[PDB]
Amino acid sequence: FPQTVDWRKKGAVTPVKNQEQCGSCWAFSATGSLEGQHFLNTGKLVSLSEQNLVDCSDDFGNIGCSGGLMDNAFQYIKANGGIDTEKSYPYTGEDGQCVFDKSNVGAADTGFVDVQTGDETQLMKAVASVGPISVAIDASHISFQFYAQGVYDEPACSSEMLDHGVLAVGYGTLNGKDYWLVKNSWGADWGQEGYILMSRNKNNQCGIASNASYPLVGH
Ligand SMILES: *[C@@H]1O[C@H](CO)[C@@H](O[C@@H]2O[C@H](CO)[C@@H](O)[C@H](O)[C@H]2NC(C)=O)[C@H](O)[C@H]1NC(C)=O
Numbered sequence: 001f002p003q004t005v006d007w008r009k010k011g012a013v014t015p016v017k018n019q020e021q022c023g024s025c026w027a028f029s030a031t032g033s034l035e036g037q038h039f040l041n042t043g044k045l046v047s048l049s050e051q052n053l054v055d056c057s058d059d060f061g062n063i064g065c066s067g068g069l070m071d072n073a074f075q076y077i078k079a080n081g082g083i084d085t086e087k088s089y090p091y092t093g094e095d096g097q098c099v100f101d102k103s104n105v106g107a108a109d110t111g112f113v114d115v116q117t118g119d120e121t122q123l124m125k126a127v128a129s130v131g132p133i134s135v136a137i138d139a140s141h142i143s144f145q146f147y148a149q150g151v152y153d154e155p156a157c158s159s160e161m162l163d164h165g166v167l168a169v170g171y172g173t174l175n176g177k178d179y180w181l182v183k184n185s186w187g188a189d190w191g192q193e194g195y196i197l198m199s200r201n202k203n204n205q206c207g208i209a210s211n212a213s214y215p216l217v218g219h
């Protein structure tokens with residue numbers, strides 16, 4: 001069982017994207033995890049459309065640029081028969097009318113799995129054995145905005161009040177501190193080329209294992 005995982009090195013992670021000034025973190029987290037599952041089951045890394053989710057998934061509980069949930073997105077994708085490619089349905093950063101096109105579908109899912117709430121050992125097993133995992137975190141603190149390098153360690157973080165969906169693409173240990181390797185949606189100039197190493201095995205810090213999930217593909 002791996003002590004260190006980095007799904008970028010296996011080709012399962014698209015480049016870092018930028019959600020701009022739209023409350024669409026849930027869409028970027030959902031496309032990130034489904035991008036991983038589609039690659040790991042086909043060998044093709046296909047970038048998927050956050051705008052498709054923002055514009056079209058209101059009937060599954062999402063509210064576009066006003067917020068949403070990754071599991072709501074996975075349910076919409078299942079009911080819809082798929083999600084368009086990023087290339088065919090690119091990102092505007094604003095609410096739009098749904099222009100989903102069946103002929104431009106890049107991936108599909110058949111449901112989703114929620115990781116046991118609060119259980120970082122189960123999240124570790126999912127990252128290792130499934131792929132990149134959608135996760136919800138408390139990113140409300142200025143220390144998160146200003147993160148540069150090393151292992152983020154914010155004792156003021158909440159594990160109950162979560163505001164930001166991101167993607168767990170690996171884990172490891174650095175300077176004796178266990179970490180989660182997390183892809184953000186704030187562009188590549190933020191953090192470490194768009195990534196952050198968050199504290200692991202520090203009592204579910206920032207709630208990273210509180211609302212973790214991934215899409216199911218196939219049977
Ligand atoms: C998503 O995470 C939230 C926040 O941790 C979970 O809500 C907590 O669930 C635990 C379950 O043991 C309860 O003890 C807490 O009272 C809940 N907290 C709040 C603030 O409501 C929630 O269950 C998670 N949802 C899913 C689907 O896993």
Ligand SMILES: *[C@@H](C(=O)O)[C@H](O)C(=O)N[C@@H](CC(C)C)C(=O)NCCCCNC(N)=[NH2+]
Pocket residue numbers: 019022023024025026061062063066067068069070135136137162163164165
């Ligand atoms: C995240 C971001 O853009 O930074 C964005 O604010 C967001 O959507 N946050 C989510 C939680 C994250 C995905 C962890 C959020 O707060 N969603 C609320 C809407 C959930 C759906 N509600 C109803 N009533 N249907």
